[PDB]
Amino acid sequence: GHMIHKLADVQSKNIGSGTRIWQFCVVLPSAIIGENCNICSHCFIENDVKIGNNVTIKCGVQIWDGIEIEDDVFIGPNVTFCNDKYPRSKQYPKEFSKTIIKKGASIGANATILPGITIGENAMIGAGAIVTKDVLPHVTYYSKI
Amino acid sequence: GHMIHKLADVQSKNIGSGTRIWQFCVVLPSAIIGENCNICSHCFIENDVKIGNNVTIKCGVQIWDGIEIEDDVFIGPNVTFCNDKYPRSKQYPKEFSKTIIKKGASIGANATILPGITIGENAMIGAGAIVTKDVLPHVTYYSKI
Amino acid sequence: GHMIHKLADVQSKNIGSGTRIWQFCVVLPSAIIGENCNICSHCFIENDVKIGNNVTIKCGVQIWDGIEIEDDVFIGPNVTFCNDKYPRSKQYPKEFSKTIIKKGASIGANATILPGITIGENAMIGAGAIVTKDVLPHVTYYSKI
Numbered sequence: 355g356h357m358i359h360k361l362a363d364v365q366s367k368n369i370g371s372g373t374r375i376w377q378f379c380v381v382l383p384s385a386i387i388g389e390n391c392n393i394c395s396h397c398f399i400e401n402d403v404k405i406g407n408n409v410t411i412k413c414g415v416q417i418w419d420g421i422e423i424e425d426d427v428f429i430g431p432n433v434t435f436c437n438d439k440y441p442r443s444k445q446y447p448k449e450f451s452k453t454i455i456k457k458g459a460s461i462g463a464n465a466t467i468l469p470g471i472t473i474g475e476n477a478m479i480g481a482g483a484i485v486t487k488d489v490l491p492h493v494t495y496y497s498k499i
Numbered sequence: 500g501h502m503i504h505k506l507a508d509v510q511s512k513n514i515g516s517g518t519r520i521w522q523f524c525v526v527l528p529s530a531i532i533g534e535n536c537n538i539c540s541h542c543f544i545e546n547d548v549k550i551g552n553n554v555t556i557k558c559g560v561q562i563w564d565g566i567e568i569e570d571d572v573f574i575g576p577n578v579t580f581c582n583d584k585y586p587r588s589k590q591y592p593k594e595f596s597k598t599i600i601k602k603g604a605s606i607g608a609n610a611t612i613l614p615g616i617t618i619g620e621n622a623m624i625g626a627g628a629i630v631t632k633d634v635l636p637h638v639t640y641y642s643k644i
Numbered sequence: 645g646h647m648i649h650k651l652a653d654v655q656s657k658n659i660g661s662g663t664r665i666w667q668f669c670v671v672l673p674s675a676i677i678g679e680n681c682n683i684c685s686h687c688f689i690e691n692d693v694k695i696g697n698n699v700t701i702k703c704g705v706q707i708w709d710g711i712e713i714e715d716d717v718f719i720g721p722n723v724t725f726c727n728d729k730y731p732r733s734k735q736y737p738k739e740f741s742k743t744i745i746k747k748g749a750s751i752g753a754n755a756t757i758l759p760g761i762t763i764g765e766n767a768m769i770g771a772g773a774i775v776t777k778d779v780l781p782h783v784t785y786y787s788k789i
């Protein structure tokens with residue numbers, strides 16, 4: 355089976371064997387999470403969400419509607435995603451922009467992923483990076499400081 | 500009335516009709532929150548705080564003493580604010596620096612708002628931006644990467 | 645004694661007099677926390693962790709295995725740390741990289757601290773900074789925007 359912490363609010367039944375979901379996580383009903391994932395404390399996971407097997411999501415991350423995470427992905431702490439390029443309060447998109455983080459990619463701590471983004475297989479996103487364009491497979495990207 | 504999630508700690512009675520406050524939020528007694536707001540999971544809202552109507556605060560945001568949010572503002576996930584330009588542990592300011600986010604402005608995911616800042620009506624702050632100076636009304640600002 | 649909020653999960657007994665640990669914090673058993681600390685809501689503190697006296701950790705911060713915080717340090721909200729320079733899901737380091745934040749240093753809101761980093765005594769890290777190199781004692785560092 356899987357481990358859902360008593361201090362998490364997990365509403366999805368679509369959770370793979372070996373997955374751990376930690377304290378103060380919210381997971382909404384339609385989320386799909388594969389096997390042997392680690393969803394660390396203080397994460398939010400919405401409905402139109404697919405997360406593969408062996409995915410690590412460190413603390414303080416939100417996976418919105420329109421975000422897909424493939425197998426073997428690492429997401430660092432306080433990483434953000436997004437599904438709305440020009441957000442205005444109460445102006446709901448007719449269709450959320452999709453992001454996909456492809457198999458084996460890693461996203462460093464506190465990176466910011468713009469909407470509509472593909473990060474290729476086995477890419478490495480530097481800590482604190484702002485990703486405004488697709489990142490090719492196996493590429494190391496970071497923002498110049 | 501308003502919706503306070505059972506897994507939130509909301510101590511303020513000053514909350515407008517239609518407002519939703521989600522799991523694992525903390526709202527301290529003197530906070531004022533208007534009507535039809537959405538305070539998403541994992542937010543902290545302090546005492547000397549005014550939030551208008553139709554405000555969206557996405558997950559993982561803290562609204563400190565000295566921060567005012569006007570009507571129709573969008574605040575993206577993991578956005579930070581601040582009320583102390585030269586912070587030192589246990590050195591409490593005599594007066595917190597004030598920030599105001601004016602009506603209809605939007606702040607992108609993981610943006611950082613320095614203390615003493617005005618963001619003008621209907622401004623758009625890019626995801627991951629560091630805002631060290633006021634942003635004029637209706638201006639799109641982002642940090643060069 | 646110390647104050648552990650009923651809505652925190654604090655598993656460590658190694659907590660100094662006068663320390664406050666707030667709602668929705670997780671503190672694992674081996675963490676050491678000194679006297680008169682303030683661990684604000686939504687923090688995660690791991691096992692191989694030493695935090696000194698009079699330390700302020702604002703909301704939304706994680707202190708990982710391998711991180712030491714000395715006395716009188718201020719850590720701003722949504723700051724990230726890290727102990728793995730080339731993270732890949734399920735590829736556990738044989739030894740976590742160590743970070744030390746030396747006495748009296750301050751780290752601004754939403755800063756990102758790379759692994760293996762020393763921040764010197766009384767340094768000041770700008771809000772949103774990415775710290776990829778040691779910061780000398782008493783130096784003010786920020787990332788060019």
Ligand SMILES: CC(C)(COP(=O)(O)OP(=O)(O)OC[C@H]1O[C@@H](n2cnc3c(N)ncnc32)[C@H](O)[C@@H]1OP(=O)(O)O)[C@@H](O)C(=O)NCCC(=O)NCCS
Binds near residue numbers: 430478483729776
């Ligand atoms: C991107 C990364 C993999 C690069 O490592 P690297 O290729 O060994 O690069 P180097 O350390 O040799 O740095 C090369 C240059 O890039 C800069 N740089 C490295 N990482 C950077 C980052 N994340 N953001 C901005 N600049 C960065 C360095 O300052 C250095 O600049 P210089 O040549 O002017 O001295 C690494 O720095 C990183 O960000 N890792 C992610 C860590 C993380 O978040 N892990 C999960 C949580 S623990």
Ligand SMILES: CC(C)(COP(=O)(O)OP(=O)(O)OC[C@H]1O[C@@H](n2cnc3c(N)ncnc32)[C@H](O)[C@@H]1OP(=O)(O)O)[C@@H](O)C(=O)NCCC(=O)NCCS
Binds near residue numbers: 438439624628642
């Ligand atoms: C700022 C923003 C509105 C700009 O959109 P835009 O005006 O269409 O700009 P473009 O996509 O045409 O990009 C123009 C340039 O600015 C850069 N840029 C855009 N947004 C940026 C950002 N947030 N930070 C740094 N650079 C950015 C692009 O890389 C591009 O560079 P180039 O000309 O060298 O190719 C948008 O990118 C953004 O950040 N939106 C906020 C999304 C968000 O956080 N929503 C809430 C959560 S879903």
Ligand SMILES: CC(C)(COP(=O)(O)OP(=O)(O)OC[C@H]1O[C@@H](n2cnc3c(N)ncnc32)[C@H](O)[C@@H]1OP(=O)(O)O)[C@@H](O)C(=O)NCCC(=O)NCCS
Binds near residue numbers: 583769786
């Ligand atoms: C770094 C800091 C201490 C510098 O303050 P300062 O020395 O008075 O510097 P100034 O305000 O005079 O700014 C000098 C320049 O650096 C830039 N700058 C200042 N802080 C910056 C930051 N954090 N990131 C990027 N640039 C910054 C300014 O835009 C200004 O640029 P300019 O000369 O082109 O106009 C302050 O800006 C800061 O970041 N404080 C931390 C606030 C915080 O996070 N507190 C805890 C939460 S409330």
Ligand SMILES: CC(=O)N[C@H]1[C@@H](O)[C@@H](C)O[C@H](OP(=O)(O)OP(=O)(O)OC[C@H]2O[C@@H](n3cc(C)c(=O)[nH]c3=O)C[C@@H]2O)[C@@H]1O
Binds near residue numbers: 394670726732735
């Ligand atoms: C800083 C960082 O992200 N480093 C990671 C990287 O090196 C990576 C390759 O391995 C580790 O990440 P994992 O999440 O896979 O660690 P693991 O040892 O499987 O699980 C411990 C994590 O679980 C989460 N957790 C654990 C417990 C016991 C808890 O109560 N609440 C909880 O949220 C957070 C812990 O860091 C490291 O933490």
Ligand SMILES: CC(=O)N[C@H]1[C@@H](O)[C@@H](C)O[C@H](OP(=O)(O)OP(=O)(O)OC[C@H]2O[C@@H](n3cc(C)c(=O)[nH]c3=O)C[C@@H]2O)[C@@H]1O
Binds near residue numbers: 576
């Ligand atoms: C990524 C992003 O910020 N996009 C937003 C933007 O497009 C914006 C214009 O609309 C949406 O934001 P809202 O917060 O207004 O969404 P809404 O549909 O009103 O409410 C769903 C949000 O409520 C919060 N929520 C919801 C539930 C059911 C919950 O259990 N816990 C909870 O925290 C987080 C959800 O994303 C989008 O999420």
Ligand SMILES: CC(=O)N[C@H]1[C@@H](O)[C@@H](C)O[C@H](OP(=O)(O)OP(=O)(O)OC[C@H]2O[C@@H](n3cc(C)c(=O)[nH]c3=O)C[C@@H]2O)[C@@H]1O
Binds near residue numbers: 581583586
């Ligand atoms: C924006 C910022 O970090 N500014 C700080 C800086 O000026 C610094 C020098 O002083 C203050 O930080 P402290 O954390 O030391 O504030 P303090 O007055 O001791 O405690 C209030 C904080 O405690 C935390 N807290 C408090 C209560 C009552 C709670 O329910 N849940 C809780 O998480 C968050 C509050 O901001 C300021 O908040």
Ligand code: NA
Binds near residue numbers: 440
């Ligand atoms: Na819009």
Ligand code: NA
Binds near residue numbers: 586587590
């Ligand atoms: Na000070």
Ligand code: NA
Binds near residue numbers: 730731732735
């Ligand atoms: Na590795």
